[PDB]
Design an enzyme around this catalytic site. Structure first.
Site, mmCIF file in Angstrom:
data_model
loop_
_atom_site.group_PDB
_atom_site.id
_atom_site.type_symbol
_atom_site.label_atom_id
_atom_site.label_comp_id
_atom_site.label_asym_id
_atom_site.label_seq_id
_atom_site.Cartn_x
_atom_site.Cartn_y
_atom_site.Cartn_z
ATOM 1 N N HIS A 122 -14.436 -38.744 26.454
ATOM 2 C CA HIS A 122 -15.070 -37.438 26.340
ATOM 3 C C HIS A 122 -16.533 -37.444 26.760
ATOM 4 O O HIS A 122 -17.152 -36.376 26.801
ATOM 5 C CB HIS A 122 -14.956 -36.926 24.901
ATOM 6 C CG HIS A 122 -14.766 -35.446 24.797
ATOM 7 N ND1 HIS A 122 -15.777 -34.546 25.052
ATOM 8 C CD2 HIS A 122 -13.682 -34.709 24.460
ATOM 9 C CE1 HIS A 122 -15.324 -33.317 24.878
ATOM 10 N NE2 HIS A 122 -14.055 -33.388 24.520
ATOM 11 N N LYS A 124 -19.885 -37.293 28.864
ATOM 12 C CA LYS A 124 -20.286 -36.603 30.088
ATOM 13 C C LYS A 124 -21.778 -36.817 30.285
ATOM 14 O O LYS A 124 -22.583 -36.266 29.530
ATOM 15 C CB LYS A 124 -19.966 -35.111 30.016
ATOM 16 C CG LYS A 124 -18.504 -34.783 29.816
ATOM 17 C CD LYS A 124 -18.325 -33.308 29.530
ATOM 18 C CE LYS A 124 -18.197 -33.044 28.044
ATOM 19 N NZ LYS A 124 -16.783 -33.126 27.599
ATOM 20 N N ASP A 129 -30.457 -42.631 40.470
ATOM 21 C CA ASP A 129 -31.540 -43.497 40.923
ATOM 22 C C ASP A 129 -32.056 -44.430 39.837
ATOM 23 O O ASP A 129 -33.079 -45.094 40.036
ATOM 24 C CB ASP A 129 -32.703 -42.681 41.500
ATOM 25 C CG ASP A 129 -32.442 -42.221 42.920
ATOM 26 O OD1 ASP A 129 -31.311 -42.420 43.412
ATOM 27 O OD2 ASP A 129 -33.366 -41.662 43.545
ATOM 28 N N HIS A 336 -19.164 -23.776 24.405
ATOM 29 C CA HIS A 336 -18.869 -25.238 24.364
ATOM 30 C C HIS A 336 -20.081 -26.051 23.892
ATOM 31 O O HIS A 336 -19.978 -27.295 23.833
ATOM 32 C CB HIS A 336 -18.420 -25.713 25.751
ATOM 33 C CG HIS A 336 -17.648 -26.990 25.753
ATOM 34 N ND1 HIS A 336 -17.790 -27.947 26.734
ATOM 35 C CD2 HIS A 336 -16.736 -27.469 24.900
ATOM 36 C CE1 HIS A 336 -16.980 -28.964 26.473
ATOM 37 N NE2 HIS A 336 -16.331 -28.693 25.363
#
Ligand SMILES: *[C@@H]1O[C@H](CO)[C@@H](O[C@@H]2O[C@H](CO)[C@@H](O)[C@H](O)[C@H]2NC(C)=O)[C@H](O)[C@H]1NC(C)=O
Ligand SMILES: *[C@@H]1O[C@H](CO)[C@@H](O[C@@H]2O[C@H](CO)[C@@H](O)[C@H](O)[C@H]2NC(C)=O)[C@H](O)[C@H]1NC(C)=O
Ligand SMILES: *[C@@H]1O[C@H](CO)[C@@H](O[C@@H]2O[C@H](CO)[C@@H](O)[C@H](O)[C@H]2NC(C)=O)[C@H](O)[C@H]1NC(C)=O
Ligand SMILES: *[C@@H]1O[C@H](CO)[C@@H](O[C@@H]2O[C@H](CO)[C@@H](O)[C@H](O)[C@H]2NC(C)=O)[C@H](O)[C@H]1NC(C)=O
Ligand SMILES: *[C@@H]1O[C@H](CO)[C@@H](O[C@@H]2O[C@H](CO)[C@@H](O)[C@H](O)[C@H]2NC(C)=O)[C@H](O)[C@H]1NC(C)=O
Ligand SMILES: *[C@@H]1O[C@H](CO)[C@@H](O[C@@H]2O[C@H](CO)[C@@H](O)[C@H](O)[C@H]2NC(C)=O)[C@H](O)[C@H]1NC(C)=O
Ligand SMILES: *[C@@H]1O[C@H](CO)[C@@H](O[C@@H]2O[C@H](CO)[C@@H](O)[C@H](O)[C@H]2NC(C)=O)[C@H](O)[C@H]1NC(C)=O
Ligand code: NAG
Ligand code: NAG
Ligand code: NAG
Ligand code: NAG
Ligand code: NAG
Ligand code: NAG
Ligand code: NAG
Ligand code: NAG
Ligand code: NAG
Ligand code: NAG
Ligand code: NAG
Ligand code: NAG
Ligand code: NAG
Ligand code: NAG
EC number: 3.1.16.1
Lengths: 414, 414, 414, 414
Positions: A122, A124, A129, A336
């Site tokens: 789950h 994210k 860089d 969300h």
């Protein structure tokens, strides 16, 4: 020289009250982050649906996501390393973005969280860089850019935090090797540097800032890395004035397991904070056509503790996103955002509040504490998060647990 | 040849429905127990208020209590040893019965419970001749005889359990020596022999029976004895059909400690039993003029968990006692029953449900399980307890948490 | 531009081997520091015995110390602030120089560490103009200047480290307020920006250097500060080639607390480094006519782990100081050095290696790491420390635990 | 009605001192236990070497062992259930006893202990008829009957303890299923009734007794089962007079893993008990021709801790069993006893004192405790164990660590 920017995404047809606070748009921030990067990009995502045809729907609002995909391919045109870690039991099955990126030359390594810990990946986040990072609840989806209200943070020109997030992503990638087994003890490199005991200190835009990260499940926690459950309990316990929270779902139980069990850790922590310390506790849980109707009894039980006479305040509200004409888009038009605001700290996570997200399902959390600086003009991250929470609370899209007007497009009682 | 019988006291002017089950009156049982004594009598009581004028009121209802005192004096007239253990912070300060008994030749002893563990000697039980026992929540007071509903149990000719209770009575008696301190480890003299895992097994009136005792706080619990909290948790967990509990007060918080804390152990156990195992949970809480109104929110929380669709059924009711022309009796007209019944056991306790009771004050519980014997006989103790609980639950004196009638008597919202 | 140089005090009548490494004398460095002061001088000390007759002794060796006091007085003649923090249960109760300085105009605050954490203010550091800094195991005492051997480090023209030690001294100064209590949390002003994982980087005389500070007890350790114990364990663990250490007293047990208990943390760390990583371990403890002999067996317990075949190499030696005619100087002729050297770092602290120095008694230490730069002529600080340790180890005054002989100055049981 | 009796095996040609304490012989006790078997026998063993030809030697001393096998075969002639669980990486690779028993109708399951957690099944115990138990340091080998000194305890007529041990045997049996894996949580069937906090309470021949069982590794411990490591730690901490321990080998390090690590838990606990409480610690390790020399320095460290003047008394000896004519038998003439007696409890174990035996290798341990009761004449179990330990200590086969007399059949420096 670290910089911190709160980023968020307001869906279509969701106007706010006049003068309400706002943050940077998610799409613009993602485009700027992708353009800035020039060496490598590492993304940890639950699934990948960046095109309308991937879901199976055709709409104009998908365009933004499509553009992002094109930008990613443009990134492949400059020979930039691109590593993706995704859960083997992914959600969107018909998507073809990953295959196209792999054909262009982007390495993609599926990690089987379903076989190892019986969960899903789950987490994210983006590390570009080794200098800039992004972390939020936003999936690699155009719905999260145009049809779902979402929140997250972006850190610019900051090295040590990027290194820590790179360590976590490297743990994910090592687990993603085919035919892999959970190590008993992680190697020396994977050990985290900043924990809740010794948070990372920095001068963000000229003001002091103590920030650190947290990971879950416990099996994926190297030495010195705080558990996200531990970080949540720490930011709850240290509270002395108020606690605000906004999650998509809140179940004090185990969702997908056998037999189901009662998991009261977060509920007990919230109740203890509300009672012993007398802090104002507010909850704002999103609702939609796909939410589980069985969550509401626990919310009502939490709100029943309200008693201003004895200095208890556990007010709870549900955030309602109107569907309108977008009924064709599935798993959309929901809030969300998952975060917590405190007068001392601020937590931004990518996991709901259930036993799965802290026992089996992988996830990451970020804790930031910004003391007031020399210049009072710059509001701290805590103040901005609190203002956003107040804007969400006072808006007409949030209703009490008793308000069940017919025109609300939610399951409610099921 | 142990004989265990349930005993209870119903206050006057509290009629029940026709055909309601009932047990033996408490006054008769105590009179018979005192009549059968020929060697020695040991009592553990919170306070002594047998004399009517002791409290400061005159009424016919106290006459019964007077008779009890007379019987005790009659015992002192037959060279019967008499030992009394009393908490240092007694409730009824104006008490002269203890002085009368001591002048007659008793062996009273004040246990400095408040000095030792900042608590009180809430345990109330009788050990007669080292063969018979009585255990209930009825302190030595005519109000419990005629003005307060009360439940307990007595056992005849059960020497083993009598010695087991004599162990904890001797614990209290030793602690009652002036200038005494808590031993680091209790001597083998006070070591128990029956615990939850190896209960005293026997043939009670031709029926298989497994019974054992508990104790509280763990500081006062000797080796081999189960803590009362542990016994309660075991009885809750092992249940698979129902859990019918009745207490005077229910607080998931520390009662009189400073600073207040949240103690959800009993609440968490009840919720877990209700949800994970899907067992029907019914709670009945006494409601009198002296009840703390702040208890009501917490109860309401437990009521809000009721979700019949999702196999989660929790019910909470308040039992009030009409006062009428009984205003002059203080601290009376309350439901003092503290017990629990499941489909597999029966727990009778002398302490309420709060952190202080299970951590600071002296409390004791008794757990009895009666398997169905080969002969039809009558009914197990579990069946009788369930019948009494159902009779109380269906009575007109038990109302829902939201049923606040204007003509009622309890504090309600205060 | 920061210039870090080591300093040491060679006791009178203590010749070294010919052609042996040395460093800057402590007295010259202190005189230079006092001469270069222009704004203020902050001092953290355990006791003050600058004058000779302060402890009641008429010897010429104190003359140098007297001179220092003179210079200090001259400082107060130039309108320069002088802040001093001393321990409330200070030794040498006949101290008079502190009163003289206070009368002249120096602000003196006696920290009540004895009643606060049941310890003493053993930390001895020095801040000048907020730009120059000194720290070593050398009390402000004449016998610490010419009769006792120690070692310390002084950094010139470094602003950030000076300000960090100023923050620590400000913590002590705030605690020195009459009727003061331990803050449960520290304000943002008392917060270190350099810790073990985020040290201060610099270009000391060209060669790169990473330096950071540590303070104890944890009660006096503010947020972001590293505990001494943590720094010591970090430097021990990081070492992969060799560990050299010199401490006056080594006790794996609590010294002044009750009841005595084992504290094997440092022992365990040393043994683990010696065995698991095959790290050569050399330890040099000090001897004096007033030394606890019970320390000796524990050292032997460390010496027995000397199996060269199993790649375990642990050596322990004691350092005696010839008393000579200086028998009339109390608490002198003792190796006061407390430092530790590895192949990668160097720790210089003001605390011994018992339990109380990291739980109750306050102390401060520094961890410095120097890597070779463009110019290899300047040897790294770790190399200089190792050279000094090797000179001390091969000195005739150092003997093994078996080298007991007539004429030695150790207590040697008895 | 449980009976407990210690049983030891004395090697051939090892005459003890005249008038020395002794217990029942191992062979006769095993034969009687097998004779009393009537329903089923469950045996957990490391390996099986019952017959002489199993190894490949020709000695008459194997006679008894062979007879044992005959007895076992006679057991299988009475249609009696027989279940044996052995480690998959078994030692004796030539033995055919298991094959013969399986041909006769036994039930042998090769537990894949090597693959599950990289260890071996070092547990050795018998559960006969579900009523009698036996457990010690004896393997199913004739070498364990007449050529290796061993100690263990056998208990008759005790159903509860037998069922408790049968639970662990069932855990091993279900782990012996092919392609089985370690469950995350063991079901309630394997939960243990008696543990450290509530040990089994019984009356052994009129003597009150408390006894429980401990298992390892942590992974193979169900709910409510105390671990061997914590059991040893608690028994050693609770000591107040002395700790007499006897073992084969004592390594405070990892044994066969990679990379090696220091494991000071037992060493730290030994030193803390010796120092803080001032107890008398005696340690007796067995040295054989196959002993690893590297153990010796570590023991010397403990011996280096001796300091009678400071109330720190620690002594260590070694047990040398003369080989004599018995040079052809491999892995023989070694003191295999593993136990430890304090003034309050007696622990009889199965595994040695090393990291693997408490983290990976599976073992079982028993903690008995007898207090004076209705039979003060009968010596308690701890008294018998102390008498046996002192008989071994005073024997001419016990040599101090400094003792390096030539001719001893011990590796020594190697
Ligand atoms: C992050 O660092 C980069 C590089 O130092 C910054 O980019 C410079 O920003 C300044 C101010 O806008 C410009 O004047 C320079 O021309 C920029 N240089 C380059 C090479 O782009 C950037 O502003 C920093 N902050 C971010 C990206 O938020
Ligand atoms: C609930 O909180 C109020 C404050 O909002 C408390 O009121 C207290 O009043 C006293 C009167 O002098 C003062 O100490 C403060 O104004 C308040 N104290 C605190 C700690 O806030 C009130 O006592 C609280 N009630 C409780 C805790 O039951
Ligand atoms: C047991 O009971 C008898 C019957 O009353 C007591 O006998 C008399 O008791 C009074 C008061 O103690 C004495 O003054 C008499 O001298 C007693 N008479 C005789 C012949 O015993 C007896 O004392 C009681 N014993 C006790 C105190 O246990
Ligand atoms: C407990 O035991 C006593 C005897 O010690 C019982 O008392 C006897 O009971 C039988 C049967 O009812 C009568 O015939 C005897 O006359 C009784 N003797 C006495 C001295 O009372 C008693 O019934 C038993 N059960 C109880 C007390 O419940
Ligand atoms: C509530 O519990 C009952 C019984 O415990 C469940 O009834 C079972 O339902 C399943 C599938 O619906 C059937 O296969 C079983 O045969 C049923 N058993 C009985 C005894 O009825 C019921 O499903 C549960 N409800 C929920 C929502 O889980
Ligand atoms: C365990 O209990 C059994 C049955 O109670 C004992 O068996 C009896 O032992 C006595 C003593 O010698 C004999 O007289 C009986 O004939 C035995 N009966 C049977 C049916 O065997 C057994 O001895 C007990 N165990 C031990 C070790 O004594
Ligand atoms: C070692 O311990 C013993 C006993 O534990 C000490 O001997 C005396 O024991 C009594 C017992 O109560 C104490 O009251 C005394 O204070 C102890 N000491 C003396 C001198 O009598 C013995 O002193 C201890 N050894 C040391 C060095 O303290
Ligand atoms: C439906 O999808 C097609 C592509 O298959 C597209 O050309 C068309 O415009 C879509 N219709 C909409 C978005 O209304
Ligand atoms: C990317 O790599 C390819 C490899 O053949 C090369 O031809 C191309 O010029 C590169 N593009 C860059 C460096 O922008
Ligand atoms: C960790 O990093 C890599 C492997 O991920 C390799 O260099 C080695 O195993 C470790 N070394 C470091 C850099 O700590
Ligand atoms: C209490 O009883 C009656 C009340 O009817 C009253 O007459 C009597 O005087 C009272 N008793 C005392 C001791 O005052
Ligand atoms: C303690 O036990 C002994 C032995 O049975 C007994 O004589 C004594 O009365 C007991 N003491 C107490 C206070 O129980
Ligand atoms: C109270 O009133 C009822 C009926 O009104 C009566 O039966 C009862 O005796 C009264 N109580 C007293 C103490 O007189
Ligand atoms: C110290 O000793 C010197 C040398 O004899 C002497 O001159 C001087 O007076 C002494 N001072 C004191 C204070 O004793
Ligand atoms: C320095 O201190 C002296 C003594 O009090 C005072 O006379 C003088 O004015 C001061 N100088 C300054 C510049 O403050
Ligand atoms: C902390 O520093 C700021 C800035 O100098 C100052 O305003 C404040 O008073 C200081 N607070 C304390 C407690 O020292
Ligand atoms: C005093 O010290 C010097 C130098 O070490 C030495 O020559 C002289 O003999 C000593 N005198 C005494 C009193 O020992
Ligand atoms: C064992 O030795 C005896 C005596 O030397 C001999 O009779 C017998 O045959 C031998 N057995 C074997 C198998 O070698
Ligand atoms: C064992 O069982 C077999 C067949 O089940 C039978 O032939 C044999 O007689 C039995 N043996 C005994 C000792 O009962
Ligand atoms: C547990 O034990 C019961 C009875 O002892 C049995 O019916 C059940 O099958 C067992 N379950 C497992 C998983 O061993
Ligand atoms: C060992 O051998 C010697 C010399 O042959 C002999 O005297 C002794 O009896 C033998 N011991 C045995 C066979 O146990």
């Amino acid at each position: 020289s670290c910089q911190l920017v709160l980023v968020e995404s307001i869906p279509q047809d969701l106007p706010s009250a006049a003068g309400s606070p706002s943050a940077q748009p998610l799409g613009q921030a993602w485009l700027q982050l992708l353009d800035t990067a020039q060496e490598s990009v590492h993304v940890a995502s639950y699934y990948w649906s960046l095109t309308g045809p991937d879901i199976g729907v055709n709409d104009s609002s998908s365009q933004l996501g499509e553009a992002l995909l094109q930008k990613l391919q443009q990134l492949l045109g400059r020979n930039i390393s691109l590593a993706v870690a995704t859960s083997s039991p992914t959600l969107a099955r018909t998507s073809t973005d990953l295959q196209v990126l792999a054909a262009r030359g982007a390495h993609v390594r599926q990690v089987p969280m379903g076989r190892l810990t019986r969960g899903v990946l789950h987490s994210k986040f983006w590390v570009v860089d080794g200098r800039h990072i992004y972390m939020g609840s936003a999936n690699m989806d155009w719905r999260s850019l145009t049809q779902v209200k979402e929140l997250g943070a972006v850190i610019y020109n900051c090295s040590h935090l990027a290194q820590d997030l790179e360590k976590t992503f490297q743990t994910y990638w090592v687990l993603g090797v085919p035919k892999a087994v959970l190590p008993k003890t992680w190697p020396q490199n994977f050990s985290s540097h900043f924990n809740r005991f010794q948070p990372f200190h920095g001068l963000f835009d000229g003001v002091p800032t103590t920030a650190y990260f947290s990971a879950s499940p416990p099996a994926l926690c190297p030495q010195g890395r705080t558990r996200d459950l531990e970080a949540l309990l720490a930011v709850m316990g240290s509270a002395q004035e108020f606690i605000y929270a906004s999650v998509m779902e809140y179940f004090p139980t185990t969702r997908f397991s056998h037999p189901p069990r009662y998991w009261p850790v977060l509920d007990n922590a919230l109740r203890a904070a509300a009672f012993g310390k007398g802090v104002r506790v507010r909850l704002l849980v999103g609702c939609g056509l796909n939410t589980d109707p069985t969550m509401f009894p626990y919310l009502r039980s939490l709100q029943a503790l309200s008693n201003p006479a004895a200095n208890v305040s556990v007010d709870v509200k549900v955030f309602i996103v109107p569907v309108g004409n977008h009924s064709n888009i599935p798993f959309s038009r929901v809030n969300h955002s998952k975060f917590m605001v405190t007068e001392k700290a601020a937590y931004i996570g990518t996991s709901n509040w259930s036993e799965d997200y802290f026992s089996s399902t992988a996830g990451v959390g970020l804790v930031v504490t910004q003391s007031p600086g020399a210049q009072p003009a710059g509001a701290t991250v805590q103040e901005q998060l609190r203002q956003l929470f107040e804007r969400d609370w006072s808006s007409r899209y949030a209703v009490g647990l008793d308000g069940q007007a017919p025109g609300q497009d939610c399951v409610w009682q099921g």
